[PDB]
Amino acid sequence: SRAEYVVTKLDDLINWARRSSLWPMTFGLACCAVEMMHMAAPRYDMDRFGVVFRASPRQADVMIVAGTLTNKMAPALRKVYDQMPEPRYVVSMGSCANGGGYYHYSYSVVRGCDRIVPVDIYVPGCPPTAEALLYGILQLQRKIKREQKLKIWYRR
Amino acid sequence: KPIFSRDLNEAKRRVRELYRAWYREVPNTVHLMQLDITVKQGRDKVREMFMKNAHVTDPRVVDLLVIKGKMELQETIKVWKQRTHVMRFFHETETPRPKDFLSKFYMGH
């Protein structure tokens, strides 16, 4: 039809790759990492959707902030987020990470990981169910599906 | 009762030894942590922090201050304290508020 049509199909392929394979960084701070482990466990099995963990930030796409972020930990979280190569997304799971959670009015807690890194998805709960975190991952995949970077480039 | 120093003179000796240690360590700290400051700025900051407590007259309080300063010195010597933790001594994110009465009247109460 048009170069615009070809570019749209190419960007659809791009987003298919990115969303089909997204490797969360092995990163968990508190309770909520246990529900992340359970979403890894057989009953839900993240790997079925192509979501496999990787320890190195250099080989990760999505950072799942799962648990309270303290003032002593925030710089390290930002450092690993920075060292993740782009494109990179952030899913803040749990109330501690969404805002402050139970420890919102504490002297040693960052009231929301979105004060340190720009968050892509927010999963409410304390902890959120493993199914709730899986729903968050699916929502992130939909977000990646609606990207159109190449169409923006071609229009530009 | 003495924590360490019997009197203000011994406390001052301890304080001056601490100042020597920090002055010596500033260059290595800047080089190792790759700070975007100069050795002059680091040593000026050390002096400013030391002088911020120059009003104290109690030997026990001076001993506590020296102990906590030694703790910070160890934390900096070792790279436990990172660049983000060290650049907080400079407050390069603060916009100073004025001390003028009229300025305060204009902004807030």
Partner: protein, 51 residues
């Protein structure tokens, strides 16, 4: 026969063992964690390792 250059020399030890300066051991320092698979995610184990 002493010389200007040999002046700084000294006789060797009576037993060949020399009193040599203490050798600094600089054991490598590692920040095992917090973002480590085995550090449980919030532990900064500072390890001094020799190898």
């Amino acid at each position: 026969y002493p010389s200007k250059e040999t002046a700084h020399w000294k006789p060797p030890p009576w037993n060949d063992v020399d009193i040599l300066k203490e050798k600094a051991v600089t054991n490598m320092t590692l920040n095992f964690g917090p973002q480590h698979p085995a550090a449980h995610g919030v532990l900064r184990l500072v390890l001094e390792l020799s190898g």
